[PDB]
DNA sequence: CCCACGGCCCATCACC
DNA sequence: GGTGATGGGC
DNA sequence: GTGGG
C-alpha cells in the first residue's frame, strides 16, 4: 500500500509473462520483486533507490523510473493494445483456462466471454464451471462471511464421524479479513502415512456438504484433493456469491506439516523452505526430512506441532498472522 | 558473466 | 481398454 | 528479470 502504483504495474507484467509469454521465471521475478517490494518500509521514489531492494534489478529499476517520471510504462501499454495478448490474458481468468488453453482459443476466434458460451462445446468441465461463476469467482470473501462458512463445514464433518479433523487454512488462518478461496484441511486417525489408502473417506464428507446444498458444483475430486464451489444460505432475498473451496485430506501424522504449508504465504512457504535447505533439511507439504552432506533425503522426522518445524531449521517462530509474505 | 529458477494432485489428450 | 505426458491450479 | 556463483 506504500508503493502501490509500482506493485500493480509489476503484477501486471508478471501476469503477462505467465499468461502470454509462458515465462514463469520472469513471472516469479516480477512477483518476488512486487511481493518483497511492498515488504519494504519506505516509499520508493527512484528505480536506483529500488534497485537496493532484493530481487529488484537493472531492468525493473529502469522500468520503475519511467513510471515515476511519466506515470505510465510503454511496454505494458503496448501489451494492453495488442488485441491478441489482451485476449489471451483475459481468458486465463476463467478457472480451467491456462496460458495454453487461452492462446489456443484466441487463435480459433474465441476472444471473449461471449465466444466461450457460443463455443461451450469445446470447453471441458472445469472450464464450464469457471465460466458459470466467472463473476462470483473474482469477488473476495470477507471474514464475517468466512466465519459462517467455517461453522457449516465443521458441523457437517463431525455429523459424519466424531473422530474427524478439519481446519480452515490459507488466508483465513492468517487473520486475512478478505480471502480469495476457502482452503480446508481434513484428517482422520484411521488415515495415517502407513495405511493402504482412503476408503471413500473424503467422498463421504463431501457428499454431506452437497447434501446440505453448501457445496454446489465440483471442479475436481480425487482420493486426496477436492476442488469445488460453495455458497452461503440467505433468509427471506438476494443470493450470496458462489465461492471457491479447496478441501485436502492428509494423514494424521503428517497433519502439522500440511497445516503449515497450506496456511503460510506461497512466498513464506518458499522463504522457509530455503532456510530449511541451507539449514540441512528438505520440507514439503507432508514431511520434513534431513539431508546428508551428500544430499540424500533421510527418513521422515517426528512432528507433533507446527512449532517443531520452526526449531529444526531454527528461524523465528512467525505465528500465522505474522506470516503474510 | 552467465544461468538455475518450485512441487504436488486431478483431469484430459494422444498414442497404442 | 491402459500407458504416460501435459495442462491447470493451488 | 534477478541474484547467486
Ligand atoms: N506453489 C504453491 N502452490 C499452491 N499453494 C501454495 C504454494 N506454496 C504455498 N502454498 C500455500 C500457500 C497458500 O496459502 C495455500 C493455499 O492457499 P491459496 O488459495 O493458494 N491462497 P491463500 O489462501 O494464501 O490466500 P487467498 O485464498 O485469499 O487468495 O497453500
Ligand atoms: Mn486460499
Ligand atoms: Mn486454494
Ligand atoms: Na537488489
Ligand atoms: Na485463472
Q: Give me ligand 3 centre to Cα A140, in Å.
A: 13
Strand segments (E) across chain A: 141-142, 165-169, 178-179, 182-187, 215-221, 225-230, 243-249, 281-283, 288-290
| Annotated binding-site residue numbers of A | 51, 53, 56, 92, 94, 97, 140, 171, 174, 180-181, 183, 246
Q: Are residues A280 and A228 both part of a single domain?
A: no
- SS3 call for A18: helix
C-alpha cell of residue A58: 537493472
Q: Which of A261, A281, A316 is the last residue of a domain?
A: A261
Q: How far apart are CA A49 and CA A70, in angstroms?
A: 17
Please indicate, yes or no, whether residues A281 and A207 belong to a single structural domain of this protein: no
Which of A53, A82, A111 is the C-terminal boundary of a domain? Answer: A82
Closest CA to A162 of A185, A200, A188: A188
Indicate whether A110 and A134 sit together in one domain: yes
Tell me, yes or no, whether A24 and A60 share the same domain: yes
A261, A294, A313 - which closes a domain? A261
Which positions ≥6 away from A155 have C-beta within 8 Å? none
Question: What are the CA-CA distances from residue A229 to residues A182, A196, A302 (Å)?
Answer: 10, 29, 35
Kindly list the protein residues whose beta carbon lies within 7 Å of any strand C atom.
Answer: A 92, 94-102, 126, 130, 170, 181, 183, 220, 227, 244, 246
Provide long-range contacts, Cβ within 8 A and 24+ apart, for A238-243: A240/A145, A241/A135, A241/A136, A241/A139, A242/A133, A242/A136, A242/A137, A242/A216, A243/A136, A243/A137, A243/A141, A243/A149, A243/A181, A243/A182
- Note whether A123 and A66 are same-domain residues: no
Query: Nearest-CA neighbor of A309 among A263, A249, A248?
Result: A263
Residues 6 or more apart in contact with residue A177 via CB below 8 angstroms: A142, A143
Q: Are residues A257 and A164 in the same domain?
A: yes
- Do residues A91 and A77 share a domain? no
Residue A163: what are its φ and ψ, rounded to 5°?
A: -95, 0
From residues 81-120 of A, which are strand D contacts by CB within 7 A?
none
For residues A147 and A245, state if they share a domain: yes
A30 CA → ligand 4 middle, Å: 13
How far CA A256 is from CA of A59, A307, A316, in Å, comes to 41, 9, 18
Number of the ligand closest to the Cα of A89: 5
User: Ligand 1, residues A145, A179, A230, A269: which to mutate, most atoms within 8 A of Cβ?
Assistant: A269
- C-alpha span between A102 and A280 (Å, rounded): 41
A287: its cell numbers:
514431511
A145 and A232 in a single domain? The answer is yes
Contact A201, A187 (CB under 8 A): no
> How many domains, in total, are found in chain A?
4
Domain match, A226 and A249 both: yes
Residues A119 and A180 in one domain: no
In the annotation, is A238 catalytic?
no
Domain of A118?
83-139
Report the structure determination method: X-ray
Assess whether A76 and A98 both reside in one domain. no
Amino acid at each position: 500500500t506504500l508503493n502501490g502504483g509500482i506493485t500493480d504495474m509489476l503484477t501486471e507484467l508478471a501476469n503477462f509473462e505467465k499468461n502470454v509469454s509462458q515465462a514463469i521465471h520472469k513471472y516469479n521475478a516480477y512477483r518476488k520483486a512486487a511481493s518483497v517490494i511492498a515488504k519494504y518500509p519506505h516509499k520508493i521514489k527512484s528505480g536506483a533507490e529500488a534497485k537496493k531492494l532484493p530481487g529488484v534489478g537493472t531492468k525493473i529499476a529502469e522500468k520503475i523510473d519511467e513510471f515515476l517520471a511519466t506515470g505510465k510504462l510503454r511496454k505494458l501499454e503496448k501489451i494492453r493494445q495488442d488485441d491478441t495478448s489482451s485476449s489471451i490474458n483475459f481468458l486465463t481468468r476463467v478457472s480451467g483456462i491456462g496460458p495454453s488453453a487461452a492462446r489456443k482459443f484466441v487463435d480459433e476466434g474465441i476472444k471473449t466471454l461471449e465466444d466461450l458460451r457460443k463455443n461451450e462445446d469445446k470447453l471441458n468441465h472445469h472450464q464450464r464451471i469457471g465460466l458459470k461463476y466467472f463473476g462470483d469467482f473474482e469477488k473476495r470473501i470477507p471474514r464475517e462471511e468466512m466465519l459462517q462458512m467455517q461453522d457449516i463445514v465443521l458441523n457437517e464433518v463431525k455429523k459424519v464421524d466424531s473422530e474427524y479433523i478439519a481446519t480452515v487454512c490459507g488466508s483465513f488462518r492468517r487473520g486475512a479479513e478478505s480471502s480469495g478461496d476457502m482452503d480446508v484441511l481434513l484428517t482422520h486417525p484411521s488415515f495415517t502415512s502407513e495405511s493402504t489408502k482412503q476408503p471413500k473417506l473424503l467422498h463421504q464428507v463431501v457428499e454431506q456438504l452437497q447434501k446440505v446444498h453448501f457445496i454446489t458444483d465440483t471442479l475436481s475430486k480425487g482420493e486426496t484433493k477436492f476442488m469445488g464451489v460453495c455458497q452461503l444460505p440467505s433468509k427471506n432475498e438476494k443470493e450470496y456469491p458462489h465461492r471457491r473451496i479447496d478441501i485436502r485430506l492428509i494423514p494424521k501424522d503428517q497433519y502439522y506439516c500440511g497445516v503449515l504449508y497450506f496456511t503460510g504465504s506461497d512466498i513464506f512457504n518458499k522463504n522457509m523452505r530455503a532456510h530449511a535447505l541451507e539449514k540441512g533439511f528438505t520440507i514439503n507439504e507432508y514431511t520434513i526430512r534431513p539431508l546428508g552432506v551428500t544430499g540424500v533425503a533421510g527418513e521422515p522426522l517426528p512432528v507433533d506441532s507446527e512449532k517443531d518445524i520452526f526449531d529444526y531449521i531454527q528461524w523465528k517462530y512467525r505465528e500465522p498472522k505474522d506470516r503474510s509474505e
